[PDB]
């Protein structure tokens, strides 16, 4: 199957999809759409929104998928990255939900004039952000292995790395000297997934 | 097992958990915590946040669960409400993600003075809300059965009903004469789940 991932230029919602395929060792085509080209392409995308995934097989079948984390969960399940038991499934989902909570705080800062952007950053960094980082640390602490859940890569590992990258976009040193569990998780994940480490280093 | 669901007084994040147990016919204890009693109870809750679920078996084991939709997904999976195939799993998750997007627009209106609350309501109702309602309508259209995904209740059905209830909290008539798929889905769901219909009618 040819898998084409269609998104805007950056690590936004598509990152969960990209990292899942990378970690699972699945080949795919990147299609980054520029702001200027979007109006033309928008009507050709079922549902008119990105990320979208177009899967084409060698017998002419075309499957369109939308909703970034639903795509990511589907692919993760296919490649045994959603937990091997019900309990591990719950713990995978628990960390995804916590990471997504944190992501929504980050979202508050987007498409705002610099002036109120810094006010929001200060608000969230003095409010919900450290609360969620600690809660995530507790989730990581409870793992029986080196990763979010056990010793094998799950979607939870991938969503966490992406959201932490957004936190450090807001304040580069926010995690410095703090949250040892999150730092250790990043080390362990990159150690366990050379494919992901290479991907993260290569990223434009 | 005794299942105790702990939340604040209302339909907020706990609703997905409550509706899942109701639809699956699982008995549980409701524990609603008042604003005034929260400070005392907060330290006794692992992670210090609600919803939380405490499950106690008849051999003294105590299991604590947090993160509302991770709990809901876990319970839904246990009771065959997350899809019967990978494709149905994806479609369940697609509608959950769409419904949660809509929920986050609703969240924008919370804990705001009446003045800017109405400005935000007008903004979202003229912006992302109708966009997401239509996208949800398309998801429903693509079902092979009467419900969100097939003919049997899934977590997607339940999350959708709860989020639509929040939209109508903001504007009672927003769906009137519009979004026929959403109206039909509500009818079909209540028809298919007398347990849920009774629960929704009884709600305080
Ligand atoms: N629930 C999201 C929704 C994606 C979304 O918000 N897409 C926006 C990203 S800019 C979009 O494509 N918007 C407007 C447009 O397509 O014109 C997902 O994770 O896929
Ligand atoms: N991701 C959410 C997080 C829940 C949450 O935001 N809980 C708030 C609801 S008011 C809370 O308990 N907050 C503050 C406190 O416990 O003092 C979930 O769905 O469970």
From Swiss-Prot, chains A, B:
GO molecular function: glutathione transferase activity
GST C-terminal domain mapped to chain residues: 85-204
PROSITE patterns: GST_CTER, GST_NTER
Phenotypic consequence of residue 7 to F: Loss of enzyme activity
Domain GST N-terminal: from-to ranges: 1-83
Chemical reaction(s) catalysed: RX + glutathione = an S-substituted glutathione + a halide anion + H(+)
Keyword tags: Transferase
Cysteines engaged in disulfide bonds, as pairs: none
One Gene Ontology biological process: glutathione metabolic process
Binding positions (glutathione): 7, 13, 38, 42, 50, 67-68, 101
Alphabetized PANTHER family for the sequence: GLUTATHIONE S-TRANSFERASE (PTHR11571), HEMATOPOIETIC PROSTAGLANDIN D SYNTHASE (PTHR11571:SF224)
Subunit structure: Homodimer.
The protein's name in its UniProt record: Glutathione S-transferase class-mu 28 kDa isozyme
Naturally occurring in which organism (per UniProt): Schistosoma haematobium
């Amino acid at each position: 199957d040819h898998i084409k991932v269609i998104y805007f230029n950056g690590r936004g919602r598509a990152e969960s999809i990209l990292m899942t395929l990378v970690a699972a060792g699945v080949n795919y085509e990147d299609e980054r759409i520029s702001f200027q080209d979007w109006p033309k392409i928008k009507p050709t995308i079922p549902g008119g929104r990105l990320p979208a995934v177009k899967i084409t097989d060698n017998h002419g079948h075309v499957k369109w998928m939308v909703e970034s984390l639903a795509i990511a969960r589907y692919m993760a399940k296919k490649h045994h990255m959603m937990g091997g038991t019900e309990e591990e499934y719950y713990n995978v989902e628990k960390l995804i939900g916590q990471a997504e909570d944190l992501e929504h705080e980050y979202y508050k800062t987007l498409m705002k004039p610099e002036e109120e952007k810094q006010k929001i950053i200060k608000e969230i960094l003095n409010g919900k952000v450290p609360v969620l980082l600690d809660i995530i640390c507790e989730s990581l602490k409870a793992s029986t292995g080196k990763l979010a859940v056990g010793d094998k890569v799950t979607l939870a590992d991938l969503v966490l790395i992406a959201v932490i990258d957004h936190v450090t976009d807001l304040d580069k040193e926010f995690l410095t000297g703090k949250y040892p569990e999150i730092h250790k998780h990043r080390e362990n994940l990159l150690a366990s997934s050379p494919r992901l480490a290479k991907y993260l280093s290569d990223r434009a």
